[PDB]
Amino acid sequence: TYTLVWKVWILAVTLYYAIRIPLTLVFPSLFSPLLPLDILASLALIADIPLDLAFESRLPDLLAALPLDLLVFALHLPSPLSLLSLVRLLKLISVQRSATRILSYRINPALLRLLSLVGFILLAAHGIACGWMSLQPPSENPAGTRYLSAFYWTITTLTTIGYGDITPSTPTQTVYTIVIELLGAAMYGLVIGNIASLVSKLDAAKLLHRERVERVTAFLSYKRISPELQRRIIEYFDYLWETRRGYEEREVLKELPHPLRLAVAMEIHGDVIEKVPLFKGAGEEFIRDIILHLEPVIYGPGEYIIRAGEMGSDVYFINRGSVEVLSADEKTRYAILSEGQFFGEMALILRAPRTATVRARAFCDLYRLDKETFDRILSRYPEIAAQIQELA
Amino acid sequence: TYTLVWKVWILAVTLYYAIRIPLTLVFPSLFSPLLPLDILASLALIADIPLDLAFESRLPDLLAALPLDLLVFALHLPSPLSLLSLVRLLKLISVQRSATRILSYRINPALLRLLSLVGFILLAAHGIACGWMSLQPPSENPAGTRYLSAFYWTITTLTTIGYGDITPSTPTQTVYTIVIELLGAAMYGLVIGNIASLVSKLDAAKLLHRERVERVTAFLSYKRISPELQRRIIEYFDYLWETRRGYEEREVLKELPHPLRLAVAMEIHGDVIEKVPLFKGAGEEFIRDIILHLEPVIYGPGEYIIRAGEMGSDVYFINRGSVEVLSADEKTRYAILSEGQFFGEMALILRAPRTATVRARAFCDLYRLDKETFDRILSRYPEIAAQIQELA
Amino acid sequence: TYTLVWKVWILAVTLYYAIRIPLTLVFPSLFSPLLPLDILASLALIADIPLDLAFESRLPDLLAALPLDLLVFALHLPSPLSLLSLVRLLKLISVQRSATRILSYRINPALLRLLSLVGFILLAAHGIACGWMSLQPPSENPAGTRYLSAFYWTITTLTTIGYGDITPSTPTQTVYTIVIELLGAAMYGLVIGNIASLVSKLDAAKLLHRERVERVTAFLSYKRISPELQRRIIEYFDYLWETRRGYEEREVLKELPHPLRLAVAMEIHGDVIEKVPLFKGAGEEFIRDIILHLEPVIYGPGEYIIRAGEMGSDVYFINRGSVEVLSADEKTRYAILSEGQFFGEMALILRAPRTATVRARAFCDLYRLDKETFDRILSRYPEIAAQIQELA
Amino acid sequence: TYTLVWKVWILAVTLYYAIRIPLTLVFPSLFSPLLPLDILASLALIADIPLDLAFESRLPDLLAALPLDLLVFALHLPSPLSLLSLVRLLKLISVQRSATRILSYRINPALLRLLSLVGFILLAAHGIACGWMSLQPPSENPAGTRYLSAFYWTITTLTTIGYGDITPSTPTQTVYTIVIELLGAAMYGLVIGNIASLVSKLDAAKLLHRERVERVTAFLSYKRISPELQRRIIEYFDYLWETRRGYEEREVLKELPHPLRLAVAMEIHGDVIEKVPLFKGAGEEFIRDIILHLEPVIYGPGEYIIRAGEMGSDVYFINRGSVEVLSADEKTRYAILSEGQFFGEMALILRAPRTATVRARAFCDLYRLDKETFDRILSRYPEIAAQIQELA
C-alpha cells in the first residue's frame, strides 16, 4: 500500500507531461515560468526506474527515462527536430501496463479497456488540436480562442459529425486532415466495438436461464403435454431464478476441490446430522462420508414426497422449506416439519413399507440419502454395521 | 394489480416533470397558468415514498421527494442557481429500477434496455435543445420556431449527421457544442452496441443446429462415406429441426427435477403402458420405475427395426410414427401398427430369436426398453419376479 | 416447384407496387398510360389469397388484397386522404415471411436478414425521396433532376454523411427531416449490428480450435514440460486441424441416433472386419456388436504402438495411416502394414506377452478393440465362446 | 521457403498494378516513360500460372493472366471501352486467398481479416479518387493539387464525416457520389463489425474465470455460508487464476490422445515414482499403469490433509507446494516435506489407522492415489500382487 501512492504519482506526472508537452511545442512563451515542475517531474521519471526494478517490455520506461526534453526547450531547436520531445509520451504504455494489472479484478476488464480508451482519446485529442493550431497561418489572436477552435475542430472530426464550418485551406493542412480523419474513424470504431462488447455479455446469467426455459417449453409443446403441468414447470423455473439465480446445485459445487467441497458441505449440514438417533456416538469419519453423498431435490407446493403404502427407500433432510405429514387417507394431519429437521429415517435399517403420507407445503429444497448408497459406504465401517443390526 | 396503476401514474408524473422543467427554465412566462399540476404532481411524488416503503439505492427517490422546485419558480432565482430544479430529474433512476423488474420476464431483456435507451435519448434531447435555446442571443422570435430549430440542431448533432447549416458563434456556445458532441457520440455508440447485442443472439436455436449439421457433414466427408447415407443423415436433421427445433430428447428433460420429470414421463406414457399383458394388475410403484428407464430412438423411413432371425432383446413402444410388420421374406405383410401401440414384447420373459421383420414407414419417434434394465429393476420386486415365471 | 414461380411473381408484383405508388403520388401525370399493369397486378394480388389458402399473421395479405387504390388515382383525392394508397405496401410483410422460410436453409440466416435489410433500405429510400420531393416549393424543373437531388439527399441523410449543401427551409420540411434523421440512425445502426453479427460467428471452427491449443500450451508451460514433446503436441493439433477440421471423433458421432450410427460404423468398418481368421463364418449380429465398440486413437510418427515384451491386451485395426513392424531389437524390419489391414490380433484368445515391436510411420488414425470389452460382449453369444476355445 | 519470396513478389506486382492502373487511366501522359515495368510485371503475371500449377476458384488468376491491358494504352481506346483494363485488378482475389492460408495460424484470423480490409479500403480509395478526378470539368491545375483534393473527398465520404466543402455539381457526379456513399457506409460498417468481433473475444480466459467465481459466490451466499470460508474460496480462485490461468487440470489433458497423454504424465511423474520402496524393481508396464490413475487435488494453506487417528486410504505425491508433518497433538513438528517427495505410503499394503497429522503450509498441488484403484489395477499383475504380501 505504499507503492500504490507512488503509482498514482507516476500516473499524475505522465498525465502532466501528456497535457503540457504539445501545448508548449506550440507556445514558446511557456516553459520558462514553469521549469521547476519540469525539474521535479523528470527527477520523478528518472527515479521511477530503480523502484521499477526493486520492490516491483521494459524499453518504454527506459526511453521515457532520459531527459531527451529540456534540450529542445533550452537550445530552441527548430520544428522538424523538436518533435523528439514527444518521446516522453511513450511513458503511457508503462502506466497502461501497470494499471491493467493492479486493479484487473476489482472491475470488469471490458469497462477498464473502455475507460482507458476514452482517456487516451481525450488525451490525444489535445495533441491533435495542438498540431492543428501549430500549422495555422500566424495572426493576432489570443491563446484561448485559437485553442478553443482547434479543439472544437478535432472533436467534430474524431466523433465523425463533421459540420464543415472551418475546413482545410493549404495542402499541408489537407494531408494532416486526411490522416486524422483515418484516426478518427479508427478511434470511433474502437469505441463502438468496446461498447458492443460491453453490453453483449452484460446479462448472461439472466439470458441463459431465459433460453433454457424457452427450450424446455418448446420441447414439451411438441409432446402435447397438459397446460396445468406446463404452468407448474414455468413457476418452478421462476422460483429457481428468483432464489439462486438459475444455477443448478450439483453443477456449481463440482468446480471446488475436495477440501473446500467437504468444508462447504460441512457448513451446510452441520445442525442437520447431529439430530438422528442412529448416527449418535458414531465417529467423525462416518459423518464426513455420508455428508458428501447427499443429493438435492426440490418439490413444488402440493407434491407427494412420500405416499403411504409405497415401499420407500430413502430418507429426506429438510434445508429450506416446510412440509406437512398426513395420514393414509390424507385427511387427519399428524404434525408439521420445518427446516433443520428430517423425516423418513425408518428405511435405512428396515425394508418396511411407508406408514404415512408427506405432502409439501411450499417449495422445499430438501436433500435426500438413498439406501443403496448408505449400505455401500456402510460396508467398510464394521462398527456401525454391527451397531445398526440391534436396531434392525 | 392495484400498485401497477400507481407505478404507471408515477411514470407519467416523472415523464411530465422531464418534459416540463427544462422548458420552463427557458420561458418564464409559463408556470403561472400551470401551477395546479405542479401542486398535484409534487404531492404525488411526496406521497409515493410511503407507498415506496409499505406494500413495496433509495436516495434518488428521497432527493426527488422534496419540493426543491417551486422556490426557484416563485422567488425568481437567477440562472446558475436555478439549475438545482433539475434535482427532480433524478426520479428517472427510480422509475428505471422499478420498470426493469416489474416486467423483466415478459420480454427480452435486451429489447427492454434498447427501448429504455431510446426513451432517455429523446427525453434528454429535449433538455439539450432547451439548453441550446437558452444560451442564444435574445431576439424577437416566436416560441415555436426557436424551439424547432434547437431540436433540429440537437438531433443533427446526436445522430452524428452534422449538416452544418446552423453552427456555434460564441465561445460559450462552442464549449456546450463540444460537450454534447461527446454525449452524442456516446449515445449513438450505445444504440449501435445495443442493436448489435440484440441481433447477435436473435437466432441461436437455428444457428446452433446449422453448426452441428455442418460439423457432422465435414467430419463424414473425411471418412469417405457414401452420398446416399449422407443424404439420409441430412434429411434426418431436417426432420429433427422441423418437429422439435433441433433439441435432443434426453438432454432437455435432464434439467427438470425428479418429481417434475416423473410427472412429464407419466403424462407421456400413460395410455401406452396400460395395454401390455404382463404389467396388468401390477402395482403403481412398478410402473413408476419402468417409466423412468425408457430410452428414445428415432428410425428413418425404411429402416429395419427388427430383423427376423436375430436374437432380439428389447421391446419398443410407439409414440408418434407408424410402422409395418412383415414376414421373414419381407413379402407378405402381417399388419400395421400406429401410435399408442407396441411390439416386440415377447423378449422380456424369453430368450427366443425374433419371428418377424418390422420395417419403419415414416419417421417413428419410438421409445424402447432393454431386457438387462428390465431384469435389473425387476429384482427388487419379488412379486412380479414370480408373476413372470409362469409366463416364462 | 410450380408455386416457386408464383412466389417470384408475387414478389415482382409487390416490388412493382413499392416502386410505383410513391412515385405516382407525386406525379399526377402518370397512372393513366400505365393503368393496365395496375389491372393485372391488382388481379394478381386478389388471386393470390386463394392460392395463399389452398396449396399453401394473415391480415397483411388481407389488407393488401383489396383495391383500396385506383379510387384515389381515379377520383383525384387530395393529399392527406391519398396516403391510404400506401396500404398496398403492407404486402412486403407477407413476402418477407414467405422468403424467410422457403430458403431458410440454403444460406446463412444472418446473411438473409442483412440482404433483406438492404432491400428494404433502398426500397424505403425511394419512398422517403418521393416524400421529400413532394413537400418542395413547386417550380419549373424536369422530373429527372428534381428526383435525383431528392434521392441524393435521402442517401446523404440515411448513411449519416450529411454534407449539408441542400438543407430544410420551411418548418414542415424540418419536421420531416428530424423524423427521417431518426430513421436514418435506426437503419444504419441495424446495418452495423447485422454486419457485426455476421462477421462475429464467421470463423467458429477455426477459432475454437485455436483457443483449445492456446489452452493446452499455457497449461503445459506451467508444468515445466520439455519443448520437444510440446512441439510434438503442437504438430499433432496441426494434423488434426488440417485433416478433419479440429473435431474429435467420438463427440461427433454421439449426436446421431442408433440406426444411423450403426450404418456409419458399418460403412467405415466393412472391408476391415471381413479379414480376420476368428470372425470368419460368425453371424451378422456378432459383427454388429463388435463394430460399435471400437475406439479411435491416433499415433504420431515414431510412436511405439506395441513394444515387444509387454503383456499386450488389445488388437488394432488400421484405417488411414501406415505402420511398420520391427523385431525385438528394433533393427530388422519384418514387413510394412498399410490401411485396410490389422495387427496384434493374437491377444483376444491368448494371455501371451507380445512378440514384436510396431512403430508408426506417419500419422495413423487406427481403431482398437480391448480384450475386456471383447470378452464382455462375447459372453452372451455362446457359439463363438466355444469357437474361440479350440484356437485358445 | 523459396516460393515465399515468389508470393511476396506477386503481391508486390499486383499492388503495383492496383496503384498504377487507375492513375494512368486518368493521365495519358504516363505509361510511356514507364512501359518497361509493364513488360516485367505482365511477364511476372503470365509466368505465375505455371508456378501456380507446379510446386503449388482458379479463373481470377486466369483472367488476370492475359495482357488485356497495353492494348488500351497503346491504341488509345476511348473511355467506356478503356475500363476493361481493370481486369488485372481481379488478381487481388488470388493474393487474398494465398495470404489467408500461408500465415493463417501465425496470427489471430480476426486481425488478419481486419488488416486485409484496411488494405483494400485504402487501395480502393485510391481508385475511387481517380474516378472522381476523372469526371471533373477539365482546367489548368497541377496533377498534385487535383489528386489531393480528390483523395481528401473520397476519405471525407468513406469515413462518413462529410464536411461538405466540395460537393457534386453535375448529375453525372451526383450518381457517382450516391453509389460511393453506399460503398462508404458498407466499408465503414465492415470496419466497425470487424473491430467489434476482434475486441469481443479478446479476453475469454479472463472473463470465463470471472463468471465462474461470480457464479460460485452468488450460489454460496444463498446457502448463508460463513464469510471466512467464502474468503478462503475466493483466494483459492485467485491462486488458480494466477498460476495456471483458470483451467482445471483434468479437463485440459482429456483432449490429448492416449500416447501423448501417457507421455505428458511420464514427463511429469518421472522423478516422483522412482523413490518409493514398493515399486522398486517393478516392471515398466506397472509404472505406466499406476501413472495414468493419479488424481490431482489442491489444498490451501492450513488445511488438514491427514488427521492422525483417521482410517486413511490414500497416498499423496507432492508436485509443487510444501507441507509439514506434525504429531497427534499438533504441537511437536516431525519434519518438513517439499516437492519431489511423498507421504502416506503406508496404506496401500495395510489397513492401519493413520499415525501422524499432515498440515499444508502453502498451496500444495499434490497428486493422490487411492487404495481401491491400486488393488483394482494390481489384480492383473500377479507378481507384484505376491511381492506386496511379504511386506503386508
Author numbering:
A (entry chain A), B (entry chain B), C (entry chain C), D (entry chain D): 10 to 65, 80 to 415
Q: What text appears in the publication on this structure?
A:
In order to address this void, we selected SthK, a prokaryotic cyclic nucleotide-modulated channel from Spirochaeta thermophila. We showed previously that SthK is activated by cyclic nucleotides and its activity is modulated by depolarizing voltages, making it more similar in this respect to CNG rather than HCN channels. SthK is a potassium selective channel, and displays a traditional potassium channel pore architecture where the selectivity filter, encoded by the TIGYGD signature sequence for potassium selection, is the same as that of KcsA and other potassium channels.
The apo structure adopts an architecture different from any of the existing CNG/HCN structures, which is expected, as it is the first apo, resting state structure of a member of the CNG channel family. We present here the high-resolution cryo-EM structures of SthK in the apo, cAMP-bound, and cGMP-bound states in lipid nanodiscs. This is, to our knowledge, the first apo, resting structure of a member of the CNG channel family. We will call this the ‘activated’ CNBD conformation. We will call this the ‘resting’ CNBD conformation. Roughly half way down the membrane, in the middle of this cavity, the side chains of I215 pointing radially towards the pore axis, constrict the pore to a diameter of the size of a dehydrated potassium ion similar to what is seen in the HCN1 and LliK channels pore. Thus, it is possible that the gate in SthK is located at a previously unreported location, in the middle of the cavity, which is the second narrowest point in the permeation pathway, after the selectivity filter. Since the channel experiences a membrane potential of 0 mV on the EM grid, and the median value for voltage activation is about 85 mV, the voltage sensor is likely in the down, resting conformation in the SthK structure. Since these channels are in lipid nanodiscs, and we see these densities in each of the three structures at the same positions, we assigned them to lipid molecules binding specifically to SthK (POPG, since the nanodiscs were assembled with this lipid only). Conversely, the conformational change is less favored when less efficacious agonists are bound, so that most bound channels are closed. Our data shows identical, closed structures for the apo and inefficacious, partial agonist-bound SthK channels, which is consistent with the concerted gating model (the functional states - closed - that we solved with cryo-EM are indicated by dashed green circles in Figure 8E, top).
